[PDB]
Design an enzyme around this catalytic site. Structure first.
Site, PDB file in Angstrom:
ATOM      1  N   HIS B 119       0.809  -1.217   0.000  1.00  0.00           N
ATOM      2  CA  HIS B 119       0.000   0.000   0.000  1.00  0.00           C
ATOM      3  C   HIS B 119       0.847   1.274   0.000  1.00  0.00           C
ATOM      4  CE1 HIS B 119      -3.372   2.652   1.546  1.00  0.00           C
ATOM      5  NE2 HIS B 119      -2.292   3.361   1.824  1.00  0.00           N
ATOM      6  N   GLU B 120       1.770   1.358   0.943  1.00  0.00           N
ATOM      7  CA  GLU B 120       2.613   2.532   1.060  1.00  0.00           C
ATOM      8  C   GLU B 120       3.429   2.808  -0.213  1.00  0.00           C
ATOM      9  OE1 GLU B 120       2.027   4.624   3.248  1.00  0.00           O
ATOM     10  OE2 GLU B 120       0.806   3.340   4.573  1.00  0.00           O
ATOM     11  N   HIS B 123       1.740   4.833  -2.656  1.00  0.00           N
ATOM     12  CA  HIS B 123       1.984   6.253  -2.519  1.00  0.00           C
ATOM     13  C   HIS B 123       3.369   6.677  -3.043  1.00  0.00           C
ATOM     14  CE1 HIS B 123      -1.599   6.593  -0.227  1.00  0.00           C
ATOM     15  NE2 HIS B 123      -1.116   6.035   0.865  1.00  0.00           N
ATOM     16  N   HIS B 129      -5.270   7.414  -1.999  1.00  0.00           N
ATOM     17  CA  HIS B 129      -6.192   6.457  -1.429  1.00  0.00           C
ATOM     18  C   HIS B 129      -7.435   6.247  -2.294  1.00  0.00           C
ATOM     19  CE1 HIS B 129      -4.116   7.386   2.603  1.00  0.00           C
ATOM     20  NE2 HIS B 129      -3.772   6.165   2.238  1.00  0.00           N
TER      21      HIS B 129
END
Ligand SMILES: [Ca+2]
Ligand SMILES: [Ca+2]
Ligand SMILES: [Zn+2]
Ligand SMILES: [Zn+2]
Lengths: 180, 165
Positions: B119-120, B123, B129
């Site tokens: 997930h990170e 970014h 998101h």
């Protein structure tokens, strides 16, 4: 930004402040520079506190959050007709800080049980632990715990238990889910 | 999906990363495998490629922190915030920080490092998101399935909208 899933009772119990409020303005505020020289800004939300369920007597008039989602910044609707259930951290008298990991939902999305639970039922349960059940089989290791089964039963953090139950100490037993 | 201002994405396809420090929760090998797997989720569906550096400067600097760890965004002890990261750019840009007051695992227990890292890194590469709880880019962690991770379509579609398949 990655956040632990949390049942509303946990959110209530863990937050410094829990309010119903409406945001009416947004403003960027200068907060210095980081180690590389990048300016650090905070977003400042001017809010109107409708009711406080928990926190310091001095009403919250401002909420700060990071500009970037990626370090857990929050975006609120600043139209002035959108109410939110805001749980978060207490700063200097009248100031509050929120992150995406805080429990923040549009007031209107709350079940009737959730709204009512903010007045006293969740506080009744704070001495109980609400434990995650990432994957079955998850067991009831201790009497002071309730097992949060929403994720593995149905696929939603705001499942059956989140919407209608609180984890509260019983007489003979210690903690158990209660719908009242 | 949701992306940060498209104009500021990684201009080069070869990116580097470095693991600055290691959680004592897992072995170095295990940490390395988690991150390698996490980067592969993204490189498998785009022209991006990732190389790990043992020392020196890397684009994606990875580190484990407890509370105040050097930036303006302190962690908060066990639970709550698990990790955060910065979008493409210099210095902090692309970096990822994991809260070591969590128990990091290669399993369903505690918090699965691979899933949070995947997930990170989203970014780090320019994704924001998603509003879909089923997408990897959804901010609230939910332990995925039983065994076999499949990058959801929305996340595939998002990253490709930036870098091409
Ligand atoms: Ca960097
Ligand atoms: Ca934490
Ligand atoms: Zn995130
Ligand atoms: Zn950090």
């Amino acid at each position: 930004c990655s956040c632990s899933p949390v049942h509303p009772q946990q959110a209530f119990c863990n937050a410094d402040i829990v309010i119903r409020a409406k945001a009416v303005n947004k403003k960027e505020v200068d907060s210095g520079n980081d180690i590389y020289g990048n300016p650090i800004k905070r977003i400042q939300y001017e809010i109107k506190q409708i009711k406080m369920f928990k926190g310091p007597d001095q009403d919250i008039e401002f909420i700060y959050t990071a500009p970037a989602a990626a370090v857990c910044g929050v975006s609120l609707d600043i139209g002035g007709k959108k109410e939110y259930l805001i749980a978060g951290k207490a700063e200097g008298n009248g100031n509050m800080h929120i992150t995406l990991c805080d429990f923040i939902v549009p007031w209107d999305t709350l079940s009737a049980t959730q709204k009512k639970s903010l007045n006293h039922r969740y506080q009744m349960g704070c001495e109980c632990k609400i434990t995650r059940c990432p994957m079955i089989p998850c067991y009831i290791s201790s009497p002071d715990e309730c097992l949060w089964m929403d994720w593995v039963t149905e696929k939603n953090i705001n499942g059956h238990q989140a919407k209608f139950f609180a984890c509260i100490k019983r007489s003979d037993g210690s903690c158990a889910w209660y719908r009242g | 999906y949701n992306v940060f201002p498209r104009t500021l994405k990684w201009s080069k396809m070869n990116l580097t990363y470095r693991i600055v420090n290691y959680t004592p929760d897992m072995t170095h090998s295990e940490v390395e495998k988690a991150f390698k797997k996490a980067f592969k989720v993204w490189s498998d569906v785009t022209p991006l490629n990732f190389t790990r550096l043992h020392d020196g400067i890397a684009d994606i600097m990875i580190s484990f922190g407890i509370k105040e760890h050097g930036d303006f965004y302190p962690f908060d002890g066990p639970s709550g915030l698990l990790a955060h990261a910065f979008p493409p750019g210099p210095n902090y840009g692309g970096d990822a920080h994991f809260d070591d007051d969590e128990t990091w695992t290669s399993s369903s227990k505690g918090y699965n490092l691979f899933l949070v890292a995947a997930h990170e890194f989203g970014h780090s590469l320019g994704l924001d998101h998603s509003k879909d709880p089923g997408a990897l880019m959804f901010p609230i962690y939910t332990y995925t399935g039983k065994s076999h991770f499949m990058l959801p379509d929305d996340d595939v579609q998002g990253i490709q909208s930036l870098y091409g398949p």
